[PDB]
mmCIF file of C-alpha atoms (C1' of nucleotides) in Angstrom:
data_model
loop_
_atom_site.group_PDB
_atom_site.id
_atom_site.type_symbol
_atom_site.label_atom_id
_atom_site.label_comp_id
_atom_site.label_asym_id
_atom_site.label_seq_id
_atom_site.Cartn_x
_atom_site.Cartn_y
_atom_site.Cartn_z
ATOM 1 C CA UNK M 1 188.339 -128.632 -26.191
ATOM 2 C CA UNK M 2 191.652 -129.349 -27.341
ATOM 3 C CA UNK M 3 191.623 -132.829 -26.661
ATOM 4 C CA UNK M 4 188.270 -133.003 -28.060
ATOM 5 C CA UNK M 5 190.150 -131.652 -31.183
ATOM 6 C CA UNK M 6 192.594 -134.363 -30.608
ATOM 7 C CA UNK M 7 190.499 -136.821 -30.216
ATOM 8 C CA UNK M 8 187.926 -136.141 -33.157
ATOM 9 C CA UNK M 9 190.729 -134.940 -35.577
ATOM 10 C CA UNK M 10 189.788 -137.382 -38.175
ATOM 11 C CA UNK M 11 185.774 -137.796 -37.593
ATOM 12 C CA UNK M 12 186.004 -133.637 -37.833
ATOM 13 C CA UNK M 13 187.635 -134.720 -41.213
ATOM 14 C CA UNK M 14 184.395 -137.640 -41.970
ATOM 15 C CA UNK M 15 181.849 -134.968 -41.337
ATOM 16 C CA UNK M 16 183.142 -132.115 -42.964
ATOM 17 C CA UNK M 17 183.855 -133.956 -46.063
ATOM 18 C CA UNK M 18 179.912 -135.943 -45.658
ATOM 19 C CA UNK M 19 178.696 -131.932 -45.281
ATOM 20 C CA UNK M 20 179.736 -130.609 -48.677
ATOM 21 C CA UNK M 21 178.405 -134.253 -50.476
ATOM 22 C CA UNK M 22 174.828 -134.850 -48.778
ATOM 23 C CA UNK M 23 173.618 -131.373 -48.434
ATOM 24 C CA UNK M 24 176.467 -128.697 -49.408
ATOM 25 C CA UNK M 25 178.573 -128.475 -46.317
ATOM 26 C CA UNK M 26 176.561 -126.820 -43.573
ATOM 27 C CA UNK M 27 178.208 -128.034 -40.752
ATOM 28 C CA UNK M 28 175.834 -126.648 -37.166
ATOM 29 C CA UNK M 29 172.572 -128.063 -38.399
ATOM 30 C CA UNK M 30 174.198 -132.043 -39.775
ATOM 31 C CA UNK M 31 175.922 -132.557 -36.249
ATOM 32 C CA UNK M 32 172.883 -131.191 -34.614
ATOM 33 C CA UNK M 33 170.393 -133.499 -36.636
ATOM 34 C CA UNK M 34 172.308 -136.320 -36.005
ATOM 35 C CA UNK M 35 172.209 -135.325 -31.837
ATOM 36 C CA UNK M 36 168.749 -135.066 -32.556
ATOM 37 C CA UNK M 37 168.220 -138.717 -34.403
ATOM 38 C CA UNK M 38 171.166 -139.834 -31.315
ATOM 39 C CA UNK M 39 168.364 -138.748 -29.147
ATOM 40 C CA UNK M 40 166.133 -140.520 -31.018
ATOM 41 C CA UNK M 41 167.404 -144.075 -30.787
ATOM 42 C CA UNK M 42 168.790 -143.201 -27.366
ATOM 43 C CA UNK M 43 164.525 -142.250 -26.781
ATOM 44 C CA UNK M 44 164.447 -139.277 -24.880
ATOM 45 C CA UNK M 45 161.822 -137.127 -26.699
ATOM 46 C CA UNK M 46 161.136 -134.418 -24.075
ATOM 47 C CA UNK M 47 165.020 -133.648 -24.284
ATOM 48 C CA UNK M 48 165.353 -133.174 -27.920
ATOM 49 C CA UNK M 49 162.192 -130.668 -27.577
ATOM 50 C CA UNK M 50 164.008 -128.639 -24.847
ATOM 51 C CA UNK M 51 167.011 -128.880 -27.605
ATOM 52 C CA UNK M 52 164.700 -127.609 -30.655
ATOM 53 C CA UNK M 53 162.831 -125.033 -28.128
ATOM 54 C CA UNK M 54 166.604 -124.223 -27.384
ATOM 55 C CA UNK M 55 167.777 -123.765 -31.200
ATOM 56 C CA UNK M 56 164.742 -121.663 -31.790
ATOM 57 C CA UNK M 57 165.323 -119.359 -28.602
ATOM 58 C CA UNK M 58 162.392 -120.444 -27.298
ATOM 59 C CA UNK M 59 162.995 -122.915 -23.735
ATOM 60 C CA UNK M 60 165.161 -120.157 -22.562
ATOM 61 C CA UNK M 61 167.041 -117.070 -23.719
ATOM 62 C CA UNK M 62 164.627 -114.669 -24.443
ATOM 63 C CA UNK M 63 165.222 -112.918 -27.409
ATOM 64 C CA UNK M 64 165.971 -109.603 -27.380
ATOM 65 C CA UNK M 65 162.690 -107.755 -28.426
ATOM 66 C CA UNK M 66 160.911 -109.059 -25.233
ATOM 67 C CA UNK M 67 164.029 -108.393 -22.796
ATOM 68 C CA UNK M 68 163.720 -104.807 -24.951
ATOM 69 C CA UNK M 69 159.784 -104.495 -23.507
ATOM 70 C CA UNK M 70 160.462 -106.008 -20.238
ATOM 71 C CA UNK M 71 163.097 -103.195 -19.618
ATOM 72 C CA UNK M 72 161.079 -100.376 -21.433
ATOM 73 C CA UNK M 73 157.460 -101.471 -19.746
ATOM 74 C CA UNK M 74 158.237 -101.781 -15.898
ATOM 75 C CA UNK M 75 160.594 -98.220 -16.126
ATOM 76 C CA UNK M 76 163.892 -99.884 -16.072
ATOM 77 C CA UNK M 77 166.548 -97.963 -16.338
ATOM 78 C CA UNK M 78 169.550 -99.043 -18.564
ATOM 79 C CA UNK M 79 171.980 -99.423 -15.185
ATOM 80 C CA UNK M 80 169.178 -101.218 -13.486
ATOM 81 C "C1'" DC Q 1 215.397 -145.750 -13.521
ATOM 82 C "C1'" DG Q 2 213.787 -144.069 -17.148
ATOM 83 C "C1'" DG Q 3 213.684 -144.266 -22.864
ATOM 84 C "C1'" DG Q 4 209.442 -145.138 -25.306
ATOM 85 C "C1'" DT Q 5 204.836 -143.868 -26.600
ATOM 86 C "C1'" DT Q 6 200.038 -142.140 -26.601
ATOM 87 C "C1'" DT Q 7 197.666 -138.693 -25.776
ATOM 88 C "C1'" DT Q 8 196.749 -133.943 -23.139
ATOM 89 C "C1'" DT Q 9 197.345 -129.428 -23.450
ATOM 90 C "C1'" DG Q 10 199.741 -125.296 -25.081
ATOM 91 C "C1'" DT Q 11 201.844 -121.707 -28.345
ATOM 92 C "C1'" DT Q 12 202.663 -119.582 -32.633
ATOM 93 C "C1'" DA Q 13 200.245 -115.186 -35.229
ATOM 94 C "C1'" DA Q 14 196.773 -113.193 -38.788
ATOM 95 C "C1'" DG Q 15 191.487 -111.851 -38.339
ATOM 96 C "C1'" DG Q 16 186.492 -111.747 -36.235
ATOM 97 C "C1'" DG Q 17 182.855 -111.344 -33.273
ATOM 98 C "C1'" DC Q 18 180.774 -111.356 -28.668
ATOM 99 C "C1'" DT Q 19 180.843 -109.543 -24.103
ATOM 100 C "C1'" DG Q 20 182.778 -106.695 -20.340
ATOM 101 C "C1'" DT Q 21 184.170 -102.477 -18.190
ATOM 102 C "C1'" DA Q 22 186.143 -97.713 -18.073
ATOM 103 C "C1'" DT Q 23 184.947 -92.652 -19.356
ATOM 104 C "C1'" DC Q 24 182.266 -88.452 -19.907
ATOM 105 C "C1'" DA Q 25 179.897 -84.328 -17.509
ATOM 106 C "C1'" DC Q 26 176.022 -84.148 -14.786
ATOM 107 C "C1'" DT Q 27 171.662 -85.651 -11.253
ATOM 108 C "C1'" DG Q 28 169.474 -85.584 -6.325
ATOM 109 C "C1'" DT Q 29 168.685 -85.514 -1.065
ATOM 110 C "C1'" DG Q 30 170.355 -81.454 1.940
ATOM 111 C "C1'" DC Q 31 164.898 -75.254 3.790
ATOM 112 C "C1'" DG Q 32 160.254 -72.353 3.617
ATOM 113 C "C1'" DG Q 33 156.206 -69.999 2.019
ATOM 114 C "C1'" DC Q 34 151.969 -68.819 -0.433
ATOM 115 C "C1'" DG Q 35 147.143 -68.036 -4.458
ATOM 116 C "C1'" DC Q 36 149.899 -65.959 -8.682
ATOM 117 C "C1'" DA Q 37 151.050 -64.465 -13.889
ATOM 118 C "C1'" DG Q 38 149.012 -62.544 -17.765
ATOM 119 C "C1'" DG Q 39 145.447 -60.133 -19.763
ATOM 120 C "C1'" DC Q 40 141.107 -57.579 -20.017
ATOM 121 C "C1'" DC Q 41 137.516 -54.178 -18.424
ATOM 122 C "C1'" DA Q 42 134.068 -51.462 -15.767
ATOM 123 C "C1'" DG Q 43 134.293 -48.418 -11.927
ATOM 124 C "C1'" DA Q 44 136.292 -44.836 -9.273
ATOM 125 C "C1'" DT Q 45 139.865 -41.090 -9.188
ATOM 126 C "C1'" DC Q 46 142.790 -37.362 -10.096
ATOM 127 C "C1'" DC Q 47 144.389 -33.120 -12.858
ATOM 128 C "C1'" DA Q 48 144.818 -28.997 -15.138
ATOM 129 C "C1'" DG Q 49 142.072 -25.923 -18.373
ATOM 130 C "C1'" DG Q 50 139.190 -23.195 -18.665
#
DNA sequence: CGGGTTTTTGTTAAGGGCTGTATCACTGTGCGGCGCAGGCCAGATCCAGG
C-alpha cells in the first residue's frame, strides 16, 4: 500500500485534480467508473456486474436488516 | 568492495471510524409428588335460649 502510494504519487495527483474539474472532486465513484469502462474494453461483463452487485451490497454482504431477521426469525441468540 | 541510485517500506503525531474483546451480575442441569387456589352456595350441623 505504501509502494502503491509510491508508485501512483503523481497519477493520485492527475486524478484528484481531473475529480474537482469534470464532476466536482468525488474521488470513489471516478476511479471506480473508470475500473468499470477498464472492464469494459478489457470485455468481461459478468465481472463488472458482480462489481456493481458488489457496490450496491447486493452479490454478497448482506446488509444489515436481513442479517437483523435472520438472527431475530430462527431464535438466535446475540452470542450465537 | 562498495558508493551510487531507485524504489520499498517505515515512522513521525494529530484525528476518525470500524471492528474486536473484556466486564458486569446472573442463568441452568443437579429430586419428587399430586388435582389445587379462589370463590360461591345449598345442605347438614351444632349451640344456647328459652
Amino acid at each position: 500500500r505504501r509502494a502503491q502510494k509510491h508508485r501512483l504519487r503523481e497519477l493520485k495527483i492527475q486524478v484528484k485534480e481531473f475529480a474537482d474539474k469534470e464532476e466536482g472532486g468525488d474521488v470513489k465513484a471516478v476511479c471506480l467508473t473508470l475500473f468499470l469502462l477498464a472492464l469494459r474494453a478489457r470485455n468481461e461483463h459478468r465481472q463488472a456486474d458482480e462489481l456493481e452487485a458488489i457496490m450496491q451490497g447486493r452479490g454478497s454482504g448482506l446488509q444489515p436488516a436481513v442479517c437483523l431477521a435472520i438472527r431475530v426469525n430462527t431464535f438466535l441468540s446475540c452470542s450465537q
